[PDB]
Amino acid sequence: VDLDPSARFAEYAHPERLVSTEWLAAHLGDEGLVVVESDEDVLLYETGHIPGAVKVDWHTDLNDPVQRDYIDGAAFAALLGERGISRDTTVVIYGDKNNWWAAYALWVFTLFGHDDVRLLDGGRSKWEAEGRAYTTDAPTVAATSYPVVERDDSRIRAYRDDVLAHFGKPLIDVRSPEEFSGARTTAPAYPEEGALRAGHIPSAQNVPWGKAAAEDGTFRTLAELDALYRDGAGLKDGDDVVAYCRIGERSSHTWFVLQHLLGFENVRNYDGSWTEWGSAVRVPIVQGSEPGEAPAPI
Amino acid sequence: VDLDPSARFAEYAHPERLVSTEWLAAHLGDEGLVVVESDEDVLLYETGHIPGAVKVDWHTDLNDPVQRDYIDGAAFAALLGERGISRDTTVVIYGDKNNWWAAYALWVFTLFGHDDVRLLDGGRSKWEAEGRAYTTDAPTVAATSYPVVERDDSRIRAYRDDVLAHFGKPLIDVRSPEEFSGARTTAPAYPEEGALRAGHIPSAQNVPWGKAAAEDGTFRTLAELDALYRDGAGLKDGDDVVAYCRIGERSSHTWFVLQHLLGFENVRNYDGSWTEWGSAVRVPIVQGSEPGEAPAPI
């Protein structure tokens, strides 16, 4: 299944990671293509979704049911086969909130080493605004076989003890400035994603995740994104960059911007994020909207 | 300042760690004695407190104001000097909820290597029930000098990574059975001490902390405590025992039972507790009222 030649994506480091609404519309039904809805609000799928599209539910499908971790490769294989996805399938993911969760799903696929995963620029917003068709029909899929591969946390995921040893290397905190400063422990809309303590990781640069998206829901031009991350947050070629929100689901979008649109080679998602960090014992915290000086590597 | 010869304390491993209401009443005003109120409800002090008694407020006095850790030895020295406590002072601590917080304060003193700290058996309850006098007078204290010593976390405190390496060695979870089982993430009365996930550390034995206390607020007889911890939770001589609640403040009472009343030589408080554990990434959790099989040391 082919690539989108849109001049807009061509400036980006990995244009192959993006498809337009017009490309996907032209490609609906193609053999080798499966469309996945990945929404923060999992109930949107049933309101209307892109024809042939399947749903991944972050509450039930992507997380261990009891323990705080992503599923293993057996459960991932059963998830993807049930949805007619094979190892070689081109997967295009779109969803609500400007592909916030679409990016998170893309990130989980990458842990499992699925190569051809792509975001539908503008997600549900831009499909809806261009008046393209939804269906409420439960799509009908022939089950396939998907290989059982071991999950790879090496390249794109950061644990707590990795972030403690990271000081002197750049940190992006993608949370509202009020959470950044420690004025709130969490966003108003998410009381259940609070922590004991308030502030940010010392030396973290506040880049709320929404700034990487235009009003239409598409990713900003490379130049605008260069302004934000290179000039604004002080990232340069070779930097080992860790991004964090409250939960890893919410820091996946920025991960995707840094790794696939700006082409930073070493980009890790700290999924523990503030829900872990603000409840952990004897981990560095500062308050105020100043990044802060980093302490000694722990 | 002398020891309480009460026959009741004499069976305990460290009788010197306990004083009765009748002993303290006989000893009020003695040079070398300072009484400390340590309450979960810090406002009780102002309702009426033991004459000459000072207050330690766990919200403001014992914790770093921003970061999740206990104060350092400079702030501890200033706390104790301000209250007329010198290195050689006998400190007797009492408070509400059957000395729940009194034990927590005793635990913080021990981190700072203060030797003669003692609990008033029965705390505020038993002082009140025997109709002994309170005052609402802000007591008046000559400031003393207290040495600056480095805080010792080696002997009585456990961090997360210590508990991950602890499997195959005994764990006491002192939380309500409903939190133990994962039916609730927290106790009804403490919504702000929840976690993302619910259950207990696999192989942990549920011994709610209240069972070590009689209805009067005194510690149970050694035999009753032997029933609970030795027979019930399967502790034997030489065991490295870690106890945990939601926060370390609440697991200090049990620590004090295991270390000073039963005389277990190696007893650590995991202060991170469930607020840390139930929000940490990729740490073992089980549900149900069965302890569970331990996994491999992490």
Numbering used by the authors:
A (entry chain A), B (entry chain A): 3 to 300
Any passages from the paper?
Sulfurtransferases, also known as rhodaneses, facilitate the transfer of sulfur from a donor molecule to a thiophilic acceptor. FrST exists as a dimer and can be classified as a TST rather than an MST according to sequence-based clustering and enzyme activity. The active site of FrST was composed of Trp102, Val176, Arg177, Glu181, Trp211, Arg248, and Arg252, which surrounded catalytic Cys247.
The overall structure of both structures is almost identical, evidenced by an RMSD of 0.284 Å (Cα). However, when FrSTI21 could closely resemble FrSTP1, a distinct conformational difference was observed in the 8α-η2 loop region at the top of the active site. In contrast, in FrSTI21, Tyr192 tilted toward the active site and engaged in cation π-interaction with Arg252 as well as a hydrogen bond with Glu42. This arrangement resulted in the formation of a cavity for substrate binding, unlike that in FrSTP1. The swinging motion of Tyr192 induced changes in the active site cavity volume of FrST. Volume analysis using ParKVFinder 3.0 revealed that the volume of the active site in FrSTP1was 8.2 Å3, whereas it was 12.3 Å3 in FrSTI21. Three substrates, namely benzenethiosulfonate, methanethiosulfonate, and thiosulfate, were docked at the active site of FrSTI21. The tetrahedral sulfonate or sulfide of each substrate was positioned at the active site in a similar conformation and interacted with the side chains of Glu181 and Arg248 as well as the backbend of Ser178 via hydrogen bonds. The benzene ring of benzenethiosulfonate was located between Tyr192 and Trp211 within a possible range of hydrophobic interactions.
